[PDB]
Amino acid sequence: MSVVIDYNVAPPNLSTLPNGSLFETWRPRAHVLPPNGQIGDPCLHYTDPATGLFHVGFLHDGSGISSATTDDLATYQDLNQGNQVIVPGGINDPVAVFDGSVIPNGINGLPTLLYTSVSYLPIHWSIPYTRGSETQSLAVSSDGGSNFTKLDQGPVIPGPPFAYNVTAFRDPYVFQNPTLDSLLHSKNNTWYTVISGGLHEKGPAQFLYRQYDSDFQYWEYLGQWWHEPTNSTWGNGTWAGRWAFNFETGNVFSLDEYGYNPHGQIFTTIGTEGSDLPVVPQLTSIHDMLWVSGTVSRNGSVSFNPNMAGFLDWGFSSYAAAGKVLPSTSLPSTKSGAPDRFISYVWLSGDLFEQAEGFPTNQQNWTGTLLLPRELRVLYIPNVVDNALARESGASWQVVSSDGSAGTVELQTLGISIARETKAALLSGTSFTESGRTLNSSGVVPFKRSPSEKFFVLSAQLSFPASARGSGLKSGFQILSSEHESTTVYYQFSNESIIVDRSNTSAAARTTDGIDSSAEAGKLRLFDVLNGGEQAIETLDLTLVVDNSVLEVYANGRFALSTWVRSWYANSTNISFFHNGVGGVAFSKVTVSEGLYDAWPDRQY
Amino acid sequence: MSVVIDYNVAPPNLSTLPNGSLFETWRPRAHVLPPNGQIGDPCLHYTDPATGLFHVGFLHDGSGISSATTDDLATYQDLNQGNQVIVPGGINDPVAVFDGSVIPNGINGLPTLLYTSVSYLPIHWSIPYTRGSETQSLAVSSDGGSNFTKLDQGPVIPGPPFAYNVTAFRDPYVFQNPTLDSLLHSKNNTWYTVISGGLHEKGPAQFLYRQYDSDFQYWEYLGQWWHEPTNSTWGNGTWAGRWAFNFETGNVFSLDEYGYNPHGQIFTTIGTEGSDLPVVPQLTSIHDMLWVSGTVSRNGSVSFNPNMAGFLDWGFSSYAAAGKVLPSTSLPSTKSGAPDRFISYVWLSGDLFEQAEGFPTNQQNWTGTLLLPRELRVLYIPNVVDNALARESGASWQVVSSDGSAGTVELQTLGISIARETKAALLSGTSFTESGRTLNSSGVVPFKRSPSEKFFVLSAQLSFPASARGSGLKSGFQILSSEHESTTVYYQFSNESIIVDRSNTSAAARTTDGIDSSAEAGKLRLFDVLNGGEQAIETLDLTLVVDNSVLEVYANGRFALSTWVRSWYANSTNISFFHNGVGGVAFSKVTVSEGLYDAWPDRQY
Ligand code: NA
Ligand code: NA
């Protein structure tokens, strides 16, 4: 008949259950992930100029790249029923297909994939590099993006520059930029490529190239346009992790206040591969998902000079972001009236980058997800008090103007928000509000009403008095609660962090190996701000999106922290105010929207 | 019982006979060829420093490189019973293994093969080049040369210099040269590599490299050290074919009067791929086997500047020569007392470079041979009369001194002779002489005694009177004669050529397709010479080596012409003087040595 799962009854050791029995247990409904099995790095994204459809791509089951389309940037349709559009086993890629990116209007006016073709394993920053392990090859889709046919020829970039002893040499990211065109005297709308990795005994780098011929055959090397010393860090390591031992999945793009602008300020997103000392062979212990702002100058060779940096996502398991220009002329953007955007999908690895030993993978029969598509833009924070907090250097913001009369500064940083159409679809459920209140004593205060399922958005504002600064205050919410489980998400002034406490999240973590219960944390500074001539600590504008086991925490349009919340019991759906009693907190009216939506309307599961 | 072959009975259409039935018919006994099947370009040759054994290599059955050893430079022992020491089907060479050469004392003190690893076909100078079709990869033999194990990594030279549109890029030839070391400030005893091919719309070239690291990993590009315009020629095309559309099998070495000398004059041997106009797609119609002398200068980049050139072998089917330094310390050289030598094996394609349609290949069950090993050295011709003949430029010799009193010059050219130990073994049979004579009338004069088998050396000197110059004289020998067949080899003053007339050579050519009967020819100038104060036309010192169907014609230590003489009848063994009646000829005493020897004493067939 069936193997019977009752989520009011206690869990077994989940690894004893049949294959596939936990497929729906923790599965999101509003996120990009394959029909089943494993998802790796997103890549390959492109707007098809002929249709306006936006194509998303991702590594799938360690065997190539799968893809789906969206006409609204909310919901998706599988290509090939989820089967890969390109697989390993060719002449150039006999061992593996690694990440690539797409020139949308390329060879023969077709989407043209430049990707890392792998011929030798293992490959890791910590071990000697095997010559020719990573080349860059071309493929073209003549069938609307369902199949990328490999060009019947060798790699267009057969290895790194002469005698370079690389740590890695992969993840080519194609992009256009008129600032680079001007500085390098390139032909207008030249395609550039960055390749990510580093050099042994020197440190991480992006290797920069430009197309030499219109046919994309030859790629002129323009130097290590950005490189950093081995395991160096932005500032003192507080705000933007470390540059660490190797760069991965380098994206390059340019922004203004509204979205993507070719003439805008230049940003990159990168994964950095970190380690404790001594290094453990073939182990990356820290996967930092960073963004970096910088100016580009020339001095013979072009250079990217960082002026601020932060995390695109503070999640331990968050990594490998791939983003793409989405033009205003796209099908989604035409419906929503958006300007040109840069949409980034962050990867949330399902198994601690394959370190989560004993996780019930055969039972779940899927692993990983992408996070919600995110709009990136230049965010301005006005009316900030010109004090030490605002002026700290080596941080994730910079002063772009000042008012000596008012005593204020305008700050600039990277804006991170849920893509507009996806956010609206997330809120299309049924909405209720919980009354605002102030808390001064220690405890958890149940909401009058909680969602009855584990699919909701929670928004609220938290205001703190001057005395919260530098104190032992902890305030936020307790979610996914019942007598056996709870998860707590809170702001903490002592280290200016948002924390997700997962020690009690999962009753399955007590019976089963490989179900991480570590705390997750990210830094967020709330500055001193001036409005109506009154100086206050900035309001914490918190959004929580819970999609079964996927938690995404957003704050103030500039912060994201995402993780796995693998609660077992059907009843673990209650929400409470939380405050540790140190000082006071005022919670606004809290909005809860329940149900989210189905991001995969043409799948049944 | 057996399929019965009687060589006194007329031949059938040979393509109707059983497979293997003609294995012995035309098979040489004193030449390098595999136990059966096809032989292609020789390559891979090396002296093993540990044993003193000389290793020879060759393409075999279109599927990699086979090898044998010699301890005497006369006789050979198969490695692996003739099975290839390296085969295609690796990561770098999934389609084919092309030519390579060996650094004898390389990685780990082991013979280290650098070779062309092929990933895409077709490849031809006349068609567009597929990117990455030819890379250069490393293999090492740790077992005494029976197996060259591919290094488990990508090619060490993944393609040609950036954006070069090559016609070909293959046949790497490793060599050392202190003249290059001095000119380029290279470390002493640096290994150089030439790679042969050309550039589309520019012409043929050798691409020059030097090792960058002691591990042979990286190869620094030093430019097209020698290149020529498309289908240009030395002089007016008389003496050294054409530079043509592509260079193949470039060897580089340096000589003195005795043999190989690192500080000597620099020479190269090359195949050139020719065509009539218009070009026929994928067809090379002319395969010229050239040698070239030149000086090396620097002008920022190093340059090889030809000062004379000729043919290493004038045979239509002669090509692809591979030679190697053989030191005085080798086993063969220690026995024979030779100094350092450069030994070259020329290939004699068995089937007109796969154009001989209908040849009975399945019946023969082998195809091709290498020619006899040849010593190359600087040859001086003294006491030549200083006239137009001696002074002609764009030819195969140059004036290196002059005596105004005597009216003479010393000439310099490339010396080509049978390697000493092989020549002695060829003459180890039973020897007889035929009396000298003068002929003035037209006809063929039978020898009093002829060899009774088709395995012999014939040596003779032909002296011509002053009036032979510019005349219609034709004199030489008729060989392999009976009532049904004959072959005529003669000198002709009208175009200063040695000719092999094959119109009557083979009774099988009348019954069977693909048995070429075209004439073979090569240029040979006999200069005016002064001895005892008498001016004469130089003596023609002729050697003919007939090894069943393999004919090699040598003259004056500076001329070689080789071809197939596929006589059928057991009785086609008679030899006659030949003279066309135009003027007179004096033949010296003619020596005939019969039997040759077995170059493969440990094979039965
Ligand atoms: Na991370
Ligand atoms: Na030839």
Q: How far apart are CA A512 and CA A525, in angstroms?
A: 37
Q: How far apart are CA B107 and CA B104, in angstroms?
A: 9
- List of chain B residues whose C-beta atoms are within 8 Å of the C-beta of residue A213: 163
**Angle subtended at Cα A71 by Cα A66 and Cα A76, rounded to the nearest 5 degrees:** 40
Which amino acid appears at position B411 of this protein? L
What's the B241 CA to ligand 2 centre distance in angstroms? 10
Give long-range contacts, CB 8 A cutoff, 24+ apart: A48-51: A48/A104, A48/A111, A48/A144, A48/A145, A49/A104, A49/A105, A51/A144, A51/A331
Cβ–Cβ gap B130/A153 under 8 Å? yes
Cβ–Cβ gap B153/A163 under 8 Å? no
Q: List the structure tokens of B449.
A: 């005694």
Q: How do A487-492 and A474-481 pair as beta strands?
A: antiparallel
DSSP state letters, B410-456: EEEEEEEEE-HHHHHHHT-SEEEEE--EEE-SEEEEE-SS--SSSEE
Which amino acid appears at position B258 of this protein? Y
The coordinates were experimentally obtained by X-ray
Q: Which residues contact A223 (CB under 8 A, 6 or more apart)?
A: A207, A208, A301, A302
Q: Does A131 touch chain B (CB under 8 A)?
A: yes
Q: How far apart are CA A303 and CA A266, in angstroms?
A: 12
Q: List the structure tokens of A409.
A: 């500064």
Please tell me the distance in Å from A49's CA to the nearest CA on chain B. 29
- List of chain B residues whose C-beta atoms are within 8 Å of the C-beta of residue A152: 120, 130
- Spell out where B256-373 has E strands: 265-274, 286-299, 301-313, 318-326, 341-348, 366-367, 369-370
Q: How far apart are CA A502 and CA A444, in angstroms?
A: 16
In angstroms, this model's resolution equals 2.1
The 10 Å Cβ neighbour count of residue B132 is 21
For chain B, helix, strand, coil in percent to 5 are 5, 45, 45
Q: Which of residues 551-580 of A touch B (CB under 8 A)?
A: none
Instruction: Name B587's bridge partners.
Output: B437, B462
Helix (H) or strand (E) holding A181: helix A178-184
Q: How far apart are CA B292 and CA B273, in angstroms?
A: 16
For chain A, list the domains and their CATH numbers: 1-427 (2.115.10.20), 428-605 (2.60.120.560)
Mutation to test the B interface, candidates A117, A152, A153, A166, most B Cβ within 10 Å? A153
Q: List the structure tokens of A368.
A: 């990983």
Asked whether the beta carbons of B196 and B170 are under 8 A apart, the reply is yes
Mutation to test the B interface, candidates A91, A127, A157, most B Cβ within 10 Å? A91
Q: How far apart are CA A389 and CA A496, in angstroms?
A: 11
Residue whose pair of structure tokens reads 């009208």 in the numeric block: B494
Cα four-point dihedral sign A159, A160, A161, A163: negative
Q: Which ligand is nearest to the CA of A289?
A: 1
Of the candidates A216, A239, A217, A241, which has an alpha carbon nearest to the alpha carbon of residue A228?
A: A241
Q: Across the interface, which of A120, A213, A217 has its CB nearest the CB of B153?
A: A120
Which amino acid appears at position A588 of this protein? S
**Angle subtended at Cα B248 by Cα B245 and Cα B251, rounded to the nearest 5 degrees:** 135
Question: In terms of DSSP H, where are the helices of B109-223?
Answer: 178-184
Q: Which residues contact A277 (CB under 8 A, 6 or more apart)?
A: none
The 10 Å Cβ neighbour count of residue A232 is 12
Q: Which residues contact A203 (CB under 8 A, 6 or more apart)?
A: A227, A228, A229, A230, A231, A232, A243, A245
Asked whether the beta carbons of B100 and B113 are under 8 A apart, the reply is yes
Instruction: Name A383's bridge partners.
Output: none
DSSP state letters, A15-75: GGSPTTTTTTTT--SSS---SSEEEEEEEEEEE-TTT-PEEEEEEETTSSEEEEEESSSS-
Cβ–Cβ gap A154/B132 under 8 Å? yes
Q: Across the interface, which of B152, B158, B213 has its CB nearest the CB of A159?
A: B158
Chain A residue with Cα closest to B162: A218
Q: List the structure tokens of A94.
A: 């006999």
- List of chain A residues whose C-beta atoms are within 8 Å of the C-beta of residue B119: 91, 154
Of the candidates B342, B343, B338, which has an alpha carbon nearest to the alpha carbon of residue B372?
A: B343
Q: What is the DSSP letter of A186?
A: P
Helix (H) or strand (E) holding A388: helix A388-391
- List of chain A residues whose C-beta atoms are within 8 Å of the C-beta of residue B157: none
The burial class, CB within 10 Å (0-12 / 13-18 / 19+), for A193 is buried
Q: Does A165 touch chain B (CB under 8 A)?
A: no
CA A599 vs. chain centroid, Å, equals 18
Q: Does B472 touch chain A (CB under 8 A)?
A: no
Q: Does B589 touch chain A (CB under 8 A)?
A: no
Q: Across the interface, which of B132, B159, B217 has its CB nearest the CB of A131?
A: B217
- Spell out where B48-131 has E strands: 54-60, 65-70, 77-78, 96-103, 112-118
Q: How far apart are CA B61 and CA B37, in angstroms?
A: 6
User: Furthest-apart CA pair in chain A: how many Å?
Assistant: 76
Cβ–Cβ gap B154/A133 under 8 Å? yes
Q: What is the DSSP letter of B153?
A: S
Q: How far apart are CA B560 and CA B514, in angstroms?
A: 25
